[PDB]
Amino acid sequence: HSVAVIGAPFSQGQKRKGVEHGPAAIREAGLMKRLSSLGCHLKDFGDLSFTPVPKDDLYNNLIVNPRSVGLANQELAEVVSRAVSDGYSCVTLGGDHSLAIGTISGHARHCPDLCVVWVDAHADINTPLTTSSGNLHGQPVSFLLRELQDKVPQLPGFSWIKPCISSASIVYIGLRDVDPPEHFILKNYDIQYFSMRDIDRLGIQKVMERTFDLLIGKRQRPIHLSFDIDAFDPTLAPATGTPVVGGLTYREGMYIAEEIHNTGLLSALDLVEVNPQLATSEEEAKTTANLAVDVIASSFGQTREG
Amino acid sequence: HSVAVIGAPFSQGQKRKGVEHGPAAIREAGLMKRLSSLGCHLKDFGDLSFTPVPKDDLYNNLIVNPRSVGLANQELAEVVSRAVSDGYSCVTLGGDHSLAIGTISGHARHCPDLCVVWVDAHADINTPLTTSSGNLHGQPVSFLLRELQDKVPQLPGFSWIKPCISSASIVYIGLRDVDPPEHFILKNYDIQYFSMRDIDRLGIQKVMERTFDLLIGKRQRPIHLSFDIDAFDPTLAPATGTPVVGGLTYREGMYIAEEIHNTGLLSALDLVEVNPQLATSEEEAKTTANLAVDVIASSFGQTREG
Amino acid sequence: HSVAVIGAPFSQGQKRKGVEHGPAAIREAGLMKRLSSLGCHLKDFGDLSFTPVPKDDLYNNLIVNPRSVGLANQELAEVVSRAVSDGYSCVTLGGDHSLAIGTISGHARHCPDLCVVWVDAHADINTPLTTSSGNLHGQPVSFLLRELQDKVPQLPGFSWIKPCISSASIVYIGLRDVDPPEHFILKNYDIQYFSMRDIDRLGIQKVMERTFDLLIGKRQRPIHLSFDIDAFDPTLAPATGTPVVGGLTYREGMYIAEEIHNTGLLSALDLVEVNPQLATSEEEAKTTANLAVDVIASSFGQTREG
Ligand SMILES: N[C@@](CCCO)(CCCC[B-](O)(O)O)C(=O)O
Ligand SMILES: N[C@@](CCCO)(CCCC[B-](O)(O)O)C(=O)O
Ligand SMILES: N[C@@](CCCO)(CCCC[B-](O)(O)O)C(=O)O
Ligand SMILES: [Mn+2]
Ligand SMILES: [Mn+2]
Ligand SMILES: [Mn+2]
Ligand SMILES: [Mn+2]
Ligand SMILES: [Mn+2]
Ligand SMILES: [Mn+2]
């Protein structure tokens, strides 16, 4: 049972400074010791240094840093693919959520039947034609879903990406801030999700049951858990760039991670969008980083009953 | 789909200064743009100025400002009745909860088969003979309930009031601070309520399902939503006159409002008891006012899934 | 209906100063008036002064203040036994949880068929051979449990203790910080528990139903409620020695207590581990003390509906 930890200090998928310090904050909160204590054999890749791209001008006068996000993701994908091939479950510390483009591509490279659990306040499924921000961290799923590719134009630095999962192969949990074109996309391609409303109705236990039934009800598949810290209520995870009131409780987040662990299928985990600079106090930054560690640890077997 | 907004800056239903600034606070939290964005056609009646009453002495050496509360409500009912008759769903911003005497009377004047969902930590059903405070914001339901007529003395300024709701036409949600004579009244007239305890047991989905079965299970009826901000836990809505621990969560509040919207029958809404002056900080005032806007917006169609 | 209140200002079951002030803090939060208001006839035993033991050296170079904890508990057990004998439901205010040794022994003397509901973030069932702290407040169940007596060494000051609880006769609620030897003990003796995880799944209503089915499903038994304030989430009860995130909500705590009261079988209650000195502010101290009073009051009939 081996875990690779990769620091992906990326900020260019969005516009708020400081999310590149997320991996450091998470390590400082004791991630490595927590993983070791659960019996994980660890390989720390440290924090990647991504190759910059000169003159990375706006795409279509809207999409920011496309070539940089493309190249960093290509490089990240290579590291992830390599680590999976060497038998590691891959933990990637962000950094903004655009790096899921790289971790999922790399993961899918030799685990092409992987499935995705995307825990997030947001659907992150705008395309370059629907985004109203230009921020790639709100578009990553659009580049990964095969059903969407007729609707996704080719960005500079993105040509290496081949859409690698189907719309039946991703489930969202925690949605509460969805743009209308994203809502259209989720309905049009019948992508399954559990918004905070569904959690309010069903409860987190049934949500996880139905999630796994949809994804691995008929066959075992390596699971890719892409966890945006903003899934949690901002009272619990204030240090993040797009906080939305009414999020997961601490207990709900742990229960999700616990059930992920319980499948035995976790193969890769992203923990993204922790931005210590956006905390109004050091206490706020640390509680956010500590929560991130709790999620990762619970995902690899830490329980609440000993 | 048209919405009238009436500010009712009234404070004389109770003794704490500042609740008359509720409407301004709610407006400053961006109410009108939020309703507009939902597609609501808006008529703003502004904030009403109520006629003062000279020498408005205590009634029975106990009940405070009876004629002022009576007259202000008569005037409010007139504005409400007129807006409902012209085809608007009527949003009244308070102000203390005694103004529900006027909004429900005025609403019933045009829609006599209305039913009432009363979301509150309190039952607000004391009569002039049971009140231990003398505050009319804690008695408004007693003046409206037909079955209580013979137990409710005639107050100066109140003669215009015709009880318009039967005891089977109101359901309470969120109760946790109920005076013993209020409890007797609720039981003796078989008035249905879901206390915080019931919500703990059933969950808010079943609570809303049962609420609608009781009210509109036999026929469609216009719905009057009377929402006291103190229904929410004090941590979420600190700026209010009688906070009680152990209240609705943010998610529960939104769920109630969403289900109200989903009936298609919402005809009037009160958002009462926001008192910015009781905030310990400007942050606390704004979070309470923002919460008020979320309740109203959700009640008119804002969703958590886009 | 008679209730005896016993202050047990003991701190030597652990190493953090201040928990000996728990009883005064709880009294200051208005305990006696709250109990009177519910119709409780009260006998106040005041705060006991426990006989000190000179030269109370570590047992086995690890276990702290054993003779002092042994003797204080013997004296406590005598007071509890006497009060229960005289027809009182016994409320014991702590003080650290090592005093449950005393209250449960005293209680069991006249009510040998008693059962125990242990509400706590922790299992408190380490033995002198498994404790890693040496603190007796984390071992009291091991001395009470019949099935364990062959694995529990004889401590100085502890010879008066006769195990009086069988493993089928105690149920835990709220567990989330369990040491591995404790987990082993719970599984090996088939001791039933509902962790925070079980509550997330079942909901607190089902948890209480099953608790009582296990304890009193076949016959009526006097109930001993041992409530560690740290069962509650640290945001609600910060003034305590071993806080653990992800605890009971206020509503869940009240619901447990309400259900205890509804059995009609509550015979004794411990409210332990309030340490006002661990509060970072007087507000935090008072809110913890107030929460303790809420629990005790609800356990004796305080309702949320009047
Ligand atoms: N949907 C957003 C906001 C658009 C304006 O409403 C937010 C995307 C958030 C990215 B995340 O990784 O945090 O979920 C976007 O930038 O696309
Ligand atoms: N029930 C109260 C308190 C009486 C003392 O227990 C409070 C009523 C609150 C009015 B609201 O509009 O806020 O719910 C009253 O004044 O009647
Ligand atoms: N289990 C602890 C911690 C051991 C180190 O992990 C804590 C016991 C808490 C005592 B309580 O009365 O608060 O539940 C112990 O001292 O045995
Ligand atoms: Mn997000
Ligand atoms: Mn995201
Ligand atoms: Mn109220
Ligand atoms: Mn009210
Ligand atoms: Mn304990
Ligand atoms: Mn404990």
PDB file of N, CA, C and O in Angstrom, chain A residues 205-257:
ATOM      1  N   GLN A 205     -25.001   9.301   3.743  1.00  0.00           N
ATOM      2  CA  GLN A 205     -24.876   7.842   3.596  1.00  0.00           C
ATOM      3  C   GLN A 205     -25.483   7.340   2.286  1.00  0.00           C
ATOM      4  O   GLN A 205     -24.848   6.566   1.557  1.00  0.00           O
ATOM      5  N   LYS A 206     -26.710   7.766   1.991  1.00  0.00           N
ATOM      6  CA  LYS A 206     -27.368   7.310   0.775  1.00  0.00           C
ATOM      7  C   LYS A 206     -26.693   7.899  -0.453  1.00  0.00           C
ATOM      8  O   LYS A 206     -26.654   7.264  -1.509  1.00  0.00           O
ATOM      9  N   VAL A 207     -26.174   9.117  -0.321  1.00  0.00           N
ATOM     10  CA  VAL A 207     -25.497   9.765  -1.442  1.00  0.00           C
ATOM     11  C   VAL A 207     -24.294   8.935  -1.902  1.00  0.00           C
ATOM     12  O   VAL A 207     -24.077   8.743  -3.102  1.00  0.00           O
ATOM     13  N   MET A 208     -23.516   8.440  -0.942  1.00  0.00           N
ATOM     14  CA  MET A 208     -22.324   7.656  -1.261  1.00  0.00           C
ATOM     15  C   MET A 208     -22.731   6.285  -1.834  1.00  0.00           C
ATOM     16  O   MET A 208     -22.091   5.778  -2.760  1.00  0.00           O
ATOM     17  N   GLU A 209     -23.800   5.696  -1.297  1.00  0.00           N
ATOM     18  CA  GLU A 209     -24.310   4.428  -1.824  1.00  0.00           C
ATOM     19  C   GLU A 209     -24.681   4.557  -3.292  1.00  0.00           C
ATOM     20  O   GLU A 209     -24.249   3.749  -4.133  1.00  0.00           O
ATOM     21  N   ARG A 210     -25.461   5.588  -3.606  1.00  0.00           N
ATOM     22  CA  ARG A 210     -25.888   5.810  -4.979  1.00  0.00           C
ATOM     23  C   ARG A 210     -24.726   6.215  -5.869  1.00  0.00           C
ATOM     24  O   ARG A 210     -24.719   5.914  -7.063  1.00  0.00           O
ATOM     25  N   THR A 211     -23.747   6.913  -5.300  1.00  0.00           N
ATOM     26  CA  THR A 211     -22.585   7.307  -6.086  1.00  0.00           C
ATOM     27  C   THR A 211     -21.848   6.059  -6.563  1.00  0.00           C
ATOM     28  O   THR A 211     -21.547   5.904  -7.751  1.00  0.00           O
ATOM     29  N   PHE A 212     -21.574   5.156  -5.630  1.00  0.00           N
ATOM     30  CA  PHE A 212     -20.829   3.946  -5.951  1.00  0.00           C
ATOM     31  C   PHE A 212     -21.636   2.993  -6.822  1.00  0.00           C
ATOM     32  O   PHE A 212     -21.082   2.333  -7.711  1.00  0.00           O
ATOM     33  N   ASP A 213     -22.944   2.933  -6.595  1.00  0.00           N
ATOM     34  CA  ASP A 213     -23.809   2.119  -7.433  1.00  0.00           C
ATOM     35  C   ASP A 213     -23.715   2.570  -8.892  1.00  0.00           C
ATOM     36  O   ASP A 213     -23.616   1.752  -9.798  1.00  0.00           O
ATOM     37  N   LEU A 214     -23.737   3.882  -9.110  1.00  0.00           N
ATOM     38  CA  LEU A 214     -23.617   4.426 -10.465  1.00  0.00           C
ATOM     39  C   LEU A 214     -22.257   4.139 -11.112  1.00  0.00           C
ATOM     40  O   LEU A 214     -22.167   3.904 -12.322  1.00  0.00           O
ATOM     41  N   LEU A 215     -21.195   4.173 -10.312  1.00  0.00           N
ATOM     42  CA  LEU A 215     -19.846   4.123 -10.866  1.00  0.00           C
ATOM     43  C   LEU A 215     -19.287   2.702 -10.899  1.00  0.00           C
ATOM     44  O   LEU A 215     -18.747   2.266 -11.910  1.00  0.00           O
ATOM     45  N   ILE A 216     -19.422   1.990  -9.787  1.00  0.00           N
ATOM     46  CA  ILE A 216     -18.795   0.692  -9.631  1.00  0.00           C
ATOM     47  C   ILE A 216     -19.823  -0.348  -9.237  1.00  0.00           C
ATOM     48  O   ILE A 216     -19.489  -1.350  -8.607  1.00  0.00           O
ATOM     49  N   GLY A 217     -21.079  -0.107  -9.599  1.00  0.00           N
ATOM     50  CA  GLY A 217     -22.136  -1.048  -9.272  1.00  0.00           C
ATOM     51  C   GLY A 217     -22.002  -2.348 -10.049  1.00  0.00           C
ATOM     52  O   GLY A 217     -22.446  -3.397  -9.583  1.00  0.00           O
ATOM     53  N   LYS A 218     -21.382  -2.292 -11.227  1.00  0.00           N
ATOM     54  CA  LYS A 218     -21.303  -3.485 -12.068  1.00  0.00           C
ATOM     55  C   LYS A 218     -19.888  -4.044 -12.266  1.00  0.00           C
ATOM     56  O   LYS A 218     -19.721  -5.210 -12.643  1.00  0.00           O
ATOM     57  N   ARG A 219     -18.881  -3.212 -12.010  1.00  0.00           N
ATOM     58  CA  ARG A 219     -17.484  -3.629 -12.108  1.00  0.00           C
ATOM     59  C   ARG A 219     -16.612  -2.771 -11.200  1.00  0.00           C
ATOM     60  O   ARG A 219     -16.947  -1.615 -10.909  1.00  0.00           O
ATOM     61  N   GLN A 220     -15.503  -3.342 -10.742  1.00  0.00           N
ATOM     62  CA  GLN A 220     -14.538  -2.598  -9.957  1.00  0.00           C
ATOM     63  C   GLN A 220     -13.790  -1.681 -10.908  1.00  0.00           C
ATOM     64  O   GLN A 220     -13.487  -2.074 -12.043  1.00  0.00           O
ATOM     65  N   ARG A 221     -13.528  -0.451 -10.467  1.00  0.00           N
ATOM     66  CA  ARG A 221     -12.814   0.540 -11.283  1.00  0.00           C
ATOM     67  C   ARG A 221     -11.966   1.386 -10.357  1.00  0.00           C
ATOM     68  O   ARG A 221     -12.389   1.688  -9.241  1.00  0.00           O
ATOM     69  N   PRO A 222     -10.755   1.758 -10.799  1.00  0.00           N
ATOM     70  CA  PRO A 222      -9.931   2.648  -9.972  1.00  0.00           C
ATOM     71  C   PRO A 222     -10.650   3.978  -9.827  1.00  0.00           C
ATOM     72  O   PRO A 222     -11.223   4.493 -10.805  1.00  0.00           O
ATOM     73  N   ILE A 223     -10.656   4.508  -8.610  1.00  0.00           N
ATOM     74  CA  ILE A 223     -11.403   5.730  -8.326  1.00  0.00           C
ATOM     75  C   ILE A 223     -10.458   6.926  -8.302  1.00  0.00           C
ATOM     76  O   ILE A 223      -9.388   6.871  -7.678  1.00  0.00           O
ATOM     77  N   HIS A 224     -10.846   7.996  -8.990  1.00  0.00           N
ATOM     78  CA  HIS A 224     -10.127   9.251  -8.896  1.00  0.00           C
ATOM     79  C   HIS A 224     -10.974  10.238  -8.092  1.00  0.00           C
ATOM     80  O   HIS A 224     -12.031  10.672  -8.559  1.00  0.00           O
ATOM     81  N   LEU A 225     -10.516  10.583  -6.885  1.00  0.00           N
ATOM     82  CA  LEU A 225     -11.234  11.537  -6.037  1.00  0.00           C
ATOM     83  C   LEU A 225     -10.654  12.928  -6.232  1.00  0.00           C
ATOM     84  O   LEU A 225      -9.521  13.193  -5.818  1.00  0.00           O
ATOM     85  N   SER A 226     -11.408  13.812  -6.889  1.00  0.00           N
ATOM     86  CA  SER A 226     -10.958  15.195  -7.058  1.00  0.00           C
ATOM     87  C   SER A 226     -11.723  16.055  -6.062  1.00  0.00           C
ATOM     88  O   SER A 226     -12.916  16.321  -6.239  1.00  0.00           O
ATOM     89  N   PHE A 227     -11.043  16.462  -4.995  1.00  0.00           N
ATOM     90  CA  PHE A 227     -11.707  17.126  -3.873  1.00  0.00           C
ATOM     91  C   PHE A 227     -11.285  18.592  -3.792  1.00  0.00           C
ATOM     92  O   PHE A 227     -10.131  18.902  -3.460  1.00  0.00           O
ATOM     93  N   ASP A 228     -12.222  19.484  -4.105  1.00  0.00           N
ATOM     94  CA  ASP A 228     -12.005  20.922  -3.991  1.00  0.00           C
ATOM     95  C   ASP A 228     -12.344  21.304  -2.556  1.00  0.00           C
ATOM     96  O   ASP A 228     -13.464  21.043  -2.097  1.00  0.00           O
ATOM     97  N   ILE A 229     -11.399  21.906  -1.834  1.00  0.00           N
ATOM     98  CA  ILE A 229     -11.649  22.235  -0.425  1.00  0.00           C
ATOM     99  C   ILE A 229     -12.915  23.106  -0.253  1.00  0.00           C
ATOM    100  O   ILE A 229     -13.565  23.046   0.792  1.00  0.00           O
ATOM    101  N   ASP A 230     -13.291  23.868  -1.289  1.00  0.00           N
ATOM    102  CA  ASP A 230     -14.489  24.711  -1.201  1.00  0.00           C
ATOM    103  C   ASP A 230     -15.800  23.906  -1.176  1.00  0.00           C
ATOM    104  O   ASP A 230     -16.886  24.482  -1.087  1.00  0.00           O
ATOM    105  N   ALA A 231     -15.705  22.578  -1.212  1.00  0.00           N
ATOM    106  CA  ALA A 231     -16.900  21.767  -1.003  1.00  0.00           C
ATOM    107  C   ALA A 231     -17.410  22.000   0.417  1.00  0.00           C
ATOM    108  O   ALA A 231     -18.626  22.003   0.670  1.00  0.00           O
ATOM    109  N   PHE A 232     -16.473  22.190   1.339  1.00  0.00           N
ATOM    110  CA  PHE A 232     -16.810  22.425   2.743  1.00  0.00           C
ATOM    111  C   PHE A 232     -17.396  23.814   2.948  1.00  0.00           C
ATOM    112  O   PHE A 232     -17.040  24.761   2.232  1.00  0.00           O
ATOM    113  N   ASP A 233     -18.270  23.947   3.946  1.00  0.00           N
ATOM    114  CA  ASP A 233     -18.769  25.266   4.318  1.00  0.00           C
ATOM    115  C   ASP A 233     -17.614  26.220   4.604  1.00  0.00           C
ATOM    116  O   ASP A 233     -16.606  25.820   5.200  1.00  0.00           O
ATOM    117  N   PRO A 234     -17.745  27.476   4.165  1.00  0.00           N
ATOM    118  CA  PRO A 234     -16.666  28.448   4.380  1.00  0.00           C
ATOM    119  C   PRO A 234     -16.295  28.656   5.860  1.00  0.00           C
ATOM    120  O   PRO A 234     -15.171  29.084   6.122  1.00  0.00           O
ATOM    121  N   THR A 235     -17.189  28.361   6.803  1.00  0.00           N
ATOM    122  CA  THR A 235     -16.810  28.430   8.217  1.00  0.00           C
ATOM    123  C   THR A 235     -15.728  27.407   8.548  1.00  0.00           C
ATOM    124  O   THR A 235     -14.953  27.596   9.482  1.00  0.00           O
ATOM    125  N   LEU A 236     -15.680  26.321   7.778  1.00  0.00           N
ATOM    126  CA  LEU A 236     -14.727  25.244   8.037  1.00  0.00           C
ATOM    127  C   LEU A 236     -13.485  25.391   7.164  1.00  0.00           C
ATOM    128  O   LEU A 236     -12.374  25.051   7.588  1.00  0.00           O
ATOM    129  N   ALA A 237     -13.675  25.884   5.942  1.00  0.00           N
ATOM    130  CA  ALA A 237     -12.561  26.041   5.017  1.00  0.00           C
ATOM    131  C   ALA A 237     -12.549  27.439   4.437  1.00  0.00           C
ATOM    132  O   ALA A 237     -12.794  27.613   3.245  1.00  0.00           O
ATOM    133  N   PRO A 238     -12.241  28.449   5.271  1.00  0.00           N
ATOM    134  CA  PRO A 238     -12.333  29.819   4.748  1.00  0.00           C
ATOM    135  C   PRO A 238     -11.246  30.152   3.733  1.00  0.00           C
ATOM    136  O   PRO A 238     -11.476  30.978   2.841  1.00  0.00           O
ATOM    137  N   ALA A 239     -10.085  29.517   3.849  1.00  0.00           N
ATOM    138  CA  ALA A 239      -8.943  29.927   3.033  1.00  0.00           C
ATOM    139  C   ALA A 239      -8.995  29.310   1.636  1.00  0.00           C
ATOM    140  O   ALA A 239      -8.263  28.358   1.323  1.00  0.00           O
ATOM    141  N   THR A 240      -9.857  29.874   0.795  1.00  0.00           N
ATOM    142  CA  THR A 240     -10.064  29.361  -0.551  1.00  0.00           C
ATOM    143  C   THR A 240     -10.638  30.496  -1.394  1.00  0.00           C
ATOM    144  O   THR A 240     -11.233  31.439  -0.849  1.00  0.00           O
ATOM    145  N   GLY A 241     -10.455  30.418  -2.710  1.00  0.00           N
ATOM    146  CA  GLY A 241     -10.758  31.540  -3.590  1.00  0.00           C
ATOM    147  C   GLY A 241     -12.215  31.819  -3.940  1.00  0.00           C
ATOM    148  O   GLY A 241     -12.590  32.969  -4.204  1.00  0.00           O
ATOM    149  N   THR A 242     -13.043  30.779  -3.959  1.00  0.00           N
ATOM    150  CA  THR A 242     -14.458  30.948  -4.285  1.00  0.00           C
ATOM    151  C   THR A 242     -15.350  30.264  -3.231  1.00  0.00           C
ATOM    152  O   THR A 242     -15.975  29.237  -3.509  1.00  0.00           O
ATOM    153  N   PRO A 243     -15.410  30.831  -2.008  1.00  0.00           N
ATOM    154  CA  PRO A 243     -16.207  30.190  -0.954  1.00  0.00           C
ATOM    155  C   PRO A 243     -17.697  30.373  -1.198  1.00  0.00           C
ATOM    156  O   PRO A 243     -18.113  31.435  -1.672  1.00  0.00           O
ATOM    157  N   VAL A 244     -18.493  29.353  -0.879  1.00  0.00           N
ATOM    158  CA  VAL A 244     -19.942  29.445  -1.034  1.00  0.00           C
ATOM    159  C   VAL A 244     -20.634  28.932   0.223  1.00  0.00           C
ATOM    160  O   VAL A 244     -20.433  27.781   0.633  1.00  0.00           O
ATOM    161  N   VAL A 245     -21.446  29.790   0.831  1.00  0.00           N
ATOM    162  CA  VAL A 245     -22.160  29.440   2.053  1.00  0.00           C
ATOM    163  C   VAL A 245     -23.031  28.193   1.848  1.00  0.00           C
ATOM    164  O   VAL A 245     -23.543  27.947   0.745  1.00  0.00           O
ATOM    165  N   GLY A 246     -23.162  27.383   2.900  1.00  0.00           N
ATOM    166  CA  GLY A 246     -24.037  26.221   2.870  1.00  0.00           C
ATOM    167  C   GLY A 246     -23.380  24.941   2.383  1.00  0.00           C
ATOM    168  O   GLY A 246     -24.000  24.163   1.638  1.00  0.00           O
ATOM    169  N   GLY A 247     -22.142  24.701   2.819  1.00  0.00           N
ATOM    170  CA  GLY A 247     -21.367  23.585   2.299  1.00  0.00           C
ATOM    171  C   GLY A 247     -21.422  22.329   3.136  1.00  0.00           C
ATOM    172  O   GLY A 247     -22.215  22.234   4.087  1.00  0.00           O
ATOM    173  N   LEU A 248     -20.586  21.350   2.790  1.00  0.00           N
ATOM    174  CA  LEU A 248     -20.492  20.135   3.602  1.00  0.00           C
ATOM    175  C   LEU A 248     -20.101  20.492   5.037  1.00  0.00           C
ATOM    176  O   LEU A 248     -19.341  21.449   5.263  1.00  0.00           O
ATOM    177  N   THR A 249     -20.635  19.745   6.003  1.00  0.00           N
ATOM    178  CA  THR A 249     -20.123  19.810   7.363  1.00  0.00           C
ATOM    179  C   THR A 249     -18.846  18.962   7.450  1.00  0.00           C
ATOM    180  O   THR A 249     -18.550  18.152   6.561  1.00  0.00           O
ATOM    181  N   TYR A 250     -18.109  19.144   8.537  1.00  0.00           N
ATOM    182  CA  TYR A 250     -16.916  18.363   8.792  1.00  0.00           C
ATOM    183  C   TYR A 250     -17.249  16.879   8.722  1.00  0.00           C
ATOM    184  O   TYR A 250     -16.588  16.107   8.010  1.00  0.00           O
ATOM    185  N   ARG A 251     -18.287  16.483   9.452  1.00  0.00           N
ATOM    186  CA  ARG A 251     -18.666  15.081   9.498  1.00  0.00           C
ATOM    187  C   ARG A 251     -19.013  14.531   8.105  1.00  0.00           C
ATOM    188  O   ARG A 251     -18.641  13.398   7.765  1.00  0.00           O
ATOM    189  N   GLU A 252     -19.697  15.335   7.290  1.00  0.00           N
ATOM    190  CA  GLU A 252     -20.067  14.891   5.949  1.00  0.00           C
ATOM    191  C   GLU A 252     -18.822  14.646   5.098  1.00  0.00           C
ATOM    192  O   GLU A 252     -18.722  13.616   4.422  1.00  0.00           O
ATOM    193  N   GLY A 253     -17.871  15.579   5.151  1.00  0.00           N
ATOM    194  CA  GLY A 253     -16.605  15.434   4.438  1.00  0.00           C
ATOM    195  C   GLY A 253     -15.834  14.186   4.838  1.00  0.00           C
ATOM    196  O   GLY A 253     -15.303  13.475   3.982  1.00  0.00           O
ATOM    197  N   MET A 254     -15.766  13.919   6.138  1.00  0.00           N
ATOM    198  CA  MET A 254     -15.109  12.716   6.624  1.00  0.00           C
ATOM    199  C   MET A 254     -15.850  11.467   6.134  1.00  0.00           C
ATOM    200  O   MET A 254     -15.226  10.471   5.758  1.00  0.00           O
ATOM    201  N   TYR A 255     -17.175  11.514   6.140  1.00  0.00           N
ATOM    202  CA  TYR A 255     -17.939  10.334   5.781  1.00  0.00           C
ATOM    203  C   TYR A 255     -17.689  10.001   4.309  1.00  0.00           C
ATOM    204  O   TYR A 255     -17.529   8.831   3.947  1.00  0.00           O
ATOM    205  N   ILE A 256     -17.634  11.032   3.472  1.00  0.00           N
ATOM    206  CA  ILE A 256     -17.303  10.849   2.066  1.00  0.00           C
ATOM    207  C   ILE A 256     -15.952  10.161   1.924  1.00  0.00           C
ATOM    208  O   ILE A 256     -15.831   9.145   1.230  1.00  0.00           O
ATOM    209  N   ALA A 257     -14.937  10.718   2.580  1.00  0.00           N
ATOM    210  CA  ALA A 257     -13.582  10.171   2.489  1.00  0.00           C
ATOM    211  C   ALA A 257     -13.536   8.741   3.015  1.00  0.00           C
ATOM    212  O   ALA A 257     -12.885   7.875   2.420  1.00  0.00           O
TER     213      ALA A 257
END
